[PDB]
Amino acid sequence: ALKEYQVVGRKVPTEHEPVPKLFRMRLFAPNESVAKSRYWYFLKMINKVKKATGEIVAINEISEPKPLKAKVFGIWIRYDSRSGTHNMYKEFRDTTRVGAVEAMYADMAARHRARFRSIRILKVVEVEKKEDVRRNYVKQLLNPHLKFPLPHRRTKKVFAPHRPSTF
Amino acid sequence: SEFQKVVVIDAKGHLLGRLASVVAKQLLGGQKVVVVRCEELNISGHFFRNKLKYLAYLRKACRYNPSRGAFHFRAPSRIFQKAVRGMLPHKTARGQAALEHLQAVEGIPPPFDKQKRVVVPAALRVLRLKPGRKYCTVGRLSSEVGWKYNDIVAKLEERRKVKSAAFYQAKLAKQKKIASAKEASPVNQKLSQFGY
Amino acid sequence: FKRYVEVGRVVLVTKGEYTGKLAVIVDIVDHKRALIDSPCSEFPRQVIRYGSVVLTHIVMKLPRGARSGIVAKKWKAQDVCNKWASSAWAKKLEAKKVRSQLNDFDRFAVMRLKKQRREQVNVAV
Amino acid sequence: HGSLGFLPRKRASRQRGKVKAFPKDDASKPVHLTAFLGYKAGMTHIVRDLDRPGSKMHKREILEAVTVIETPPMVVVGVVGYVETPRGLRSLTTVWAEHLSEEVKRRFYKNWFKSKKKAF
Amino acid sequence: DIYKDETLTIPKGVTVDIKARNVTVTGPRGTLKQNLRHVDIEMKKQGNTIKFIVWHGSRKHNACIRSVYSIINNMIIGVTQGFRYKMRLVYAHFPININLTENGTVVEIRNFLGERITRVIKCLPGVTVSISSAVKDEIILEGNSLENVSQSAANIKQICNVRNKDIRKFLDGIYVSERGNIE
Amino acid sequence: AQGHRLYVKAKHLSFQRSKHVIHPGTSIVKIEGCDSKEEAQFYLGKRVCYVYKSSKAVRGSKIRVIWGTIARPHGNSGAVRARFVHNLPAKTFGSSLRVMLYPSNI
RNA sequence: CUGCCGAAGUUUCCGGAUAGCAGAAACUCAGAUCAGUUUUAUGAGUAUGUAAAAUGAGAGUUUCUAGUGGGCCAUUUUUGGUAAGCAGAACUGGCGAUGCGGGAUGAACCGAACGUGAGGUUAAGGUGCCGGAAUGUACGCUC
RNA sequence: GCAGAUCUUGGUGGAAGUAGC
RNA sequence: GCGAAACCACAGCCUGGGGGGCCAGGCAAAAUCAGCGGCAGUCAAGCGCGACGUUGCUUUCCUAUCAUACCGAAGCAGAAUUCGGUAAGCGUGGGAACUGAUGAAG
RNA sequence: AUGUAUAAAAAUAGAGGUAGGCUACUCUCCUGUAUCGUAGAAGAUGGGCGAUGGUUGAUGAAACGGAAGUGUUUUAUUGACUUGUCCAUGAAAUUCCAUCGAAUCCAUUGCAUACGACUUUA
C-alpha cells in the first residue's frame, strides 16, 4: 500500500543563521521511515542541505478528504532514465491520490521499467476541467452515455460437472 | 471434490498443457482417468504454431540403428499421452504404475458413451484464453502429419450424437412427467420451508 | 439480453465480506473499478471491482452520483428488493441460505419429507 | 546397397505372396474381384505384331519374352467382414460355406493324414 | 477506447440474418450463406439496420471491423443488385476457343496462341459465365457472390497466362475490363 | 451399504519432504471437501487410519490397520499433516485412508 | 577406538635464522593492562597521523617446542598497452582444513559453518506437473 | 592389531570346455 | 576325447549438459549364434570530433546452386544469353553396439 | 470399496425451451452446497389404516446396442422385500475407542538351406 506524508524540516541553527527556513514536501511512501529518507534525498539535490546538517521536525499523513468522489489526476514526473533525463506528464482517473501513484508506479514499471529510486515525482494536481484532459481513453470513460460489457469475467474444486456459462 | 474410482474427462474445449497437468496429479493421487474426445483438444498458438514444434520433433532420431530412435507418434491420443508422460516420474516404479491408470482415447467408445463426462474448469479454452486468440485443434493438426483416420471419426461421432440426442429427448420427456408429479405431491409446497 | 455496466445498475457482490448482498452501482470510474452503494445500512458505500462482483439483469433509473439517502429514496420507490426476489435467480440463492442453516434433525426431517413425497409416483399410466 | 526402400535385407515370412494394398472402387461399379492365385510354370517367348503408332517398329514383328502361369479355377468358400474403427480395420464375422475339400482342410492342419481330420 | 461502432442500413433484402454465427444474407435475387468467423465482433440488429460494434478493444481487431462492414455490404450488393462482369479477350492470329459447359461452369478454352493444351476453367460455385454476344471476344460472367465471381475470372486470367515469351510483342490475351453490378 | 461410513474418505498424498530430503515420520493427507487451511482446523486432532488386506489370516480375519492422528494444516489447499503410530509405507502413495470423526468436538 | 586443542601456507636476514600463527609450565596484574572498532580534540594539505571518550573483553611476561614460507581464484586502484584480447605492481577476502539448503548436476554464485534426537520458526530459492508449497490476489506490458 | 606394498606362501575362481591337438 | 593362458576395482545402450558412474531426457524384457580497402582534405547526423556524402593515386552431412525443376527482371521478335529468387530432392563449393537367424514366455 | 448412484449437444461479442404458421411473445442458464436413494435384533417378529403404487430375485422372453457392441429398454409370468402411515415384543455385563485333442523329434521333401529354420509328404 501507500500513504502520502506531509514532511517539513530545516537545518541546525547556528549563530550565523539563527532561523533556518522550513521546507514542505507532499510525497508518497509505504511507511514513514522511507518518507524521512526520501525527504532528505530531494532536499539534498535542490537545497544542498546534507543529512549531516539537517534535522526533521514533523511527519503527518494526508488522508483524502473526498475518497468517495471520482476524480482525475494529472501527474508530473521527473524520471531518472539510463541517460537520466525525463520530465513526464501523465493522467490517471481514480478516487484517491494514494491510489493514483500506485497505478502510476505500476504502468511506469511496465512500459519504462522504472524502479523505486529511479523515480522522483514532481507535482500532483487534481485536474478538474473536461477540456484540459489531454488523453483520448481517459476522456471516453467520462461521457455521460458510457457503457461496456464486463471484461475479464471468470464468473479450487476441480472437475466441474457441466460447462461454465461464461455469459 | 471428486474421489471417484473412475472419472471420464471429455476434452473438447480444454487446453493440452493445462489438462495434462491437472490429470497428471490425479493419476498420482490414485484415480483412474479416461480422457475421451482427446481428438478435439486445443493448444494456444495458431495452426502452424505447434506444427513446426512437432515437425521439428520428427527431425530428431537416433544415429545408431535408426529403428531405435525416437518414436514420433501421430495419433491425437498419443499426442496427449506424451504430454502426461513427462509430467510423471515414468522412470520409477510409481510412474509406470500410474500410467496404466490413464486410458486416453479419441472419439467416444461405447464403454464410455453411456457414462458421465466431467470437465475441468481450470484448463478450459473459453476461460483461460483471451477472446479472439490463435488456437489450433490437435485432431485437426495431427491429421496433417499422418493420422489418416480423420474422416472416419468425424463420421462416427456424428452418428453417436443423434443417437445420444434421441436418448436425451426420452430422458427429457421423463422428467417432464415428474415435473408435474413433483408439485402434484402437495407436501412439497407447504413443506419447502426446509430450504428444499 | 446481454447485460451491461450502466449508472444505477443493480449488482451482486460475489467475493467479499458483503458476499451476496444486493448493491447498486453509482458511478463508473474506470474499466476495473466503480462506485457502488446499497440501501442496507450494513453495506457502506465503497469501490467494488468487477472481478469480485456479478452483474444482475435488473436496472433502475438514477442520475449520476446520488447520495446514499437518495439511493435509498430511489430504491424504495422503484422497489428493487422483492423485484429481485421475484426472479428464479433469487429463489435458488435464497434457498441456498436456508438449506445451510439446516440442523441435523431438520436435515433428518427432510428425509421424512421426501419419503412422504416419493410414493407420489402414482401417475397417469 | 543404395535402394534403402527395400533395406533392411531380411527374408520374408509367408511363402505365399501377401497382398497389402487393395484398389479403390465405387458403389456405382458392378461387383467384381481383384486378386487370384497362380503358379510359376516358366519363361518362354513369343512373336507378335505391334499395332503401336509412333514407335520405331510401327506395324512390325517383334519377339517378346513372356511367362506362362498355371492358374486353376478358384474355389470360394466364404466371406469375412470388416468394420471401420479409429484403431484401423477389424474383422467382424468370418462366415464360411458348408463343405470343404480335404485339400483346404489340409490347410488348417499340420498332419492331416495323422490327425482325426475333424476340422469344420 | 471502449467502443468502436459502425452501422449500415439494411436494404429490402430478404434476410440480413446473422443468427447462429453465420451470414445468411438472402435478397431478392437469391439467398447467400457465409461463415461469420472473421473476428469476434458484435453484430447487432436494430430495426432496418445491422450494427457492427467492437467494444473495448485495440486496433488489431478494430481494423477488421470495417472489413465485415464491407463484406456484408458486398453481400448486400450481391443480394440486392447482384454482380455482372464482362471480360474481354484479345486475338491477333490464332483465335482462342471458348466453350461454356455445365450451364457455363466448365469453360472449355483452347487455341490460346494456337496451343493444343485443353484449358478447362471450372467456375466457382454460384456464378454463371457466358460469351457476350454484343461485342466479339467478350465473356459476360454474372452471379450473386462477387468474391467467387471476381476470383473465378482472375483464375481465368491466370488460366491462359502468358509465359516464356516477351510480354511486349506478344500482347494479345485474356483481360477483364467491365466489373459491375447485375442491376 | 449407505447406512454406514461414519468416517471421511481421504487419500494419503506423500511424505513430508523437501526437494531431495524426505521425512517419512510425518505424512501428508488430503481430506475430501477440505479446501482451505482455515477449513482444515475442523479435522485437527481426529484419529485417522489406513486399512488394507493382507493375505495370511491371523485372529480369525485378514484386515490390518495402522492408526494415527492429524497435527497441522499444510499449505493453502486444505491438505493436512498427519502422524501415525507406525510410519506409513512408501508404497501407499495415492492410497485411501479414513479420517474417523473422533475425538469429536463439534 | 574415542575425546580435547589446533595452525601457517607471507615475511626478515643469511638451505640455516628470527619474528608470526598453535601450544606447556613458571611468574606476573584486577587494572585503564588491553582492543583487524567507533567517537571528540590537536594538528596535517573528504581524506592523514597523533592523544584522552564510547563500546565491549580479564590482560601480561618470559622460559621450551612441533608444523609452516605452495598456490587457485574473487575485490578495487593501476601504468604499459590494441584489430582483438591482455601483461604487470599493490589491497582485501575465500579455499587450502568445510560438511549442509538452493544455483537442474559444478569449489570459486546465493544462504549458512556441523555432537545425538523431538517439536516449532526461518535464510537462499521457490509454490502448474516431475517437486514439498497460491493454476493466489493487483495492475500494466508481449505475438 | 592389517585392505593395500606390480607384497610372501598356500588355496580357489571368471575368461571356457573358449584358444587349441 | 584331451584341454590351457593372457587378463580380471565393479563394469557394460545412446543424446545434451558438467565419463561408464552425475543431472535431464530417448527409452527398457529373457536365452543364444554367424559376419562386424587504406591515407590526406571539404563538409555536417548530432553530441573537438561527427554518419551517409564530395575532392585527390593505388560413407555422410551442409547451401554459400556447378546443371536439372519453377518463376522474376533485362533492347527479353524467336532462338540463344545475362541478372535475381525458391530450391541441396536427384546429379555433376565445403564437413567427417552396427546387420542377420534362432528362440521360451500373459 | 463402505452409495462402488448420475451418458444430449453446441456456443461463449451466447444458448435451450414456450405459442402459433416458418415465426413473434414469454420463460429458463449465470454451478452439482443440485438431482437420486438411504431407519428397522446389519436392518428383527406381529397387528391394523391407505395404494395398484414402489422394490428386487427366479425367469420364458422380445426389441434393441458393433467405435472396444463389457450394455440399454419393454416386459409378460412367478415370487419374496413391501414401514406408504399408525401401534405391539426383542436388542443390553462388548456396562469409557481398540476391528481326449493337437503339435514337435525321428521319417519324408526342395520351392529352402552354414548351423537353425522354412517348405512338402507321412
PDB file of C-alpha atoms (C1' of nucleotides) in Angstrom, chain B residues 64-65 68 70 85 90-91 96, chain I residues 13 25-28 97-99:
ATOM      1  CA  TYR B  64      22.525 -45.778 -34.493  1.00  0.00           C
ATOM      2  CA  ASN B  65      20.112 -48.326 -35.993  1.00  0.00           C
ATOM      3  CA  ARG B  68      15.928 -47.445 -32.308  1.00  0.00           C
ATOM      4  CA  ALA B  70      12.543 -41.583 -31.019  1.00  0.00           C
ATOM      5  CA  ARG B  85       4.437 -38.952 -19.777  1.00  0.00           C
ATOM      6  CA  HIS B  90       7.912 -42.571 -15.559  1.00  0.00           C
ATOM      7  CA  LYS B  91      11.392 -43.967 -14.835  1.00  0.00           C
ATOM      8  CA  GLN B  96       4.866 -46.697 -14.785  1.00  0.00           C
TER       9      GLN B  96
ATOM     10  C1'   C I  13      22.655 -48.794 -24.548  1.00  0.00           C
ATOM     11  C1'   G I  25      15.988 -36.903 -21.478  1.00  0.00           C
ATOM     12  C1'   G I  26      15.255 -41.145 -25.536  1.00  0.00           C
ATOM     13  C1'   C I  27      13.770 -45.455 -23.977  1.00  0.00           C
ATOM     14  C1'   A I  28      13.844 -50.879 -21.497  1.00  0.00           C
ATOM     15  C1'   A I  97      26.737 -51.772 -30.175  1.00  0.00           C
ATOM     16  C1'   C I  98      26.149 -51.858 -36.149  1.00  0.00           C
ATOM     17  C1'   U I  99      23.229 -56.080 -39.756  1.00  0.00           C
TER      18        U I  99
END
